[PDB]
Amino acid sequence: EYDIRGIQEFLDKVSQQGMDVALQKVENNINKMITTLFDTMRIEELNRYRDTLRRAILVMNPATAKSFITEVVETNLVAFDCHWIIINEEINDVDVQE
Amino acid sequence: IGISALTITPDRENVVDFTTRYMDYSVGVLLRRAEKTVDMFACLAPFDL
Amino acid sequence: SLQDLSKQTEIPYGTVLDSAVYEHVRMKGLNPFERDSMYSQMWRMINRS
Numbered sequence: 001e002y003d004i005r006g007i008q009e010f011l012d013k014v015s016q017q018g019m020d021v022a023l024q025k026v027e028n029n030i031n032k033m034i035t036t037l038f039d040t041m042r043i044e045e046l047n048r049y050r051d052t053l054r055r056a057i058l059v060m061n062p063a064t065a066k067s068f069i070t071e072v073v074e075t076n077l078v079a080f081d082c083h084w085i086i087i088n089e090e091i092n093d094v095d096v097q098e
Numbered sequence: 099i100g101i102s103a104l105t106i107t108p109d110r111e112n113v114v115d116f117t118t119r120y121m122d123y124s125v126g127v128l129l130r131r132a133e134k135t136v137d138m139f140a141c142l143a144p145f146d147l
Numbered sequence: 148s149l150q151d152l153s154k155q156t157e158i159p160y161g162t163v164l165d166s167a168v169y170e171h172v173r174m175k176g177l178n179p180f181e182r183d184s185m186y187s188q189m190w191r192m193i194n195r196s
Contacts, residue, residue, distance in 0.1 A: 031109050031170065038177040046179065065106035076180050105167050125168060127149070127160075 002059060017052045022052070026060065030071050050077055062095045153188040161193055169193075 002025070004046065014021050027033045038082055054070070065086065072078055105123055113128045152160070162168050175181060176190025 028112070029109065030112075031174065037175065040178065043179055050180075064112065067112050070108050075174070075178055076182075086191060106186075107167060127152070129158075 006058060006061075018074060022079070026064065026068060028067060034071060053078055053094065054082050056082070058086045059088075062091055066095070066098055153185040155170055158191075159192065160189075 012022060037049070041049070058068070060068075069084075100114075104110075106119060110116075162172070172186065172189060172193060175183075176185035177187070181187060188194075
């Protein structure tokens with residue numbers, strides 16, 4: 001439900017410094033999304049994917065973020081070195097804990 | 099309200115809200131019992147009665 | 148237990164379609180970064196045809 005015009009201003013301020021920004025929508029059917037990767041990518045390419053998730057930004061509804069963090073961690077696509085930032089305007093103290 | 103053996107999973111929890119869990123989950127298997135037994139007739143088993 | 152069962156082939160095995168168990172086994176089986184090597188075996192039996 002995010003309207004990516006709201007980050008139209010990263011473009012001319014990270015293409016300059018030359019970082020490797022990527023987008024990717026997160027579905028409602030998380031498990032279909034994850035399993036399609038294991039079903040379709042080569043085991044060479046997929047090892048260049050875990051190289052990216054060591055950094056991330058999440059911009060989403062916390063009730064989705066909980067389930068996405070749980071699926072990503074549980075499928076072992078990340079390890080003790082990642083540094084996922086999360087941003088929102090509203091997150092109450094029940095969800096910071098979880 | 100729904101109530102049964104309904105295991106919590108993130109893709110379900112995304113659209114309905116679960117209480118604290120009241121019993122722990124576990125996968126298992128059911129198999130048929132075999133034979134291998136011993137009896138008085140085992141002395142005579144090589145031939146039909 | 149379960150670790151041998153993934154290796155024998157004289158007795159076939161399976162589960163209820165579109166249960167949570169079926170999706171659990173599909174999740175573990177495809178994942179190339181699984182540490183175990185039982186789960187990615189079982190899928191090759193269940194998924195026949």
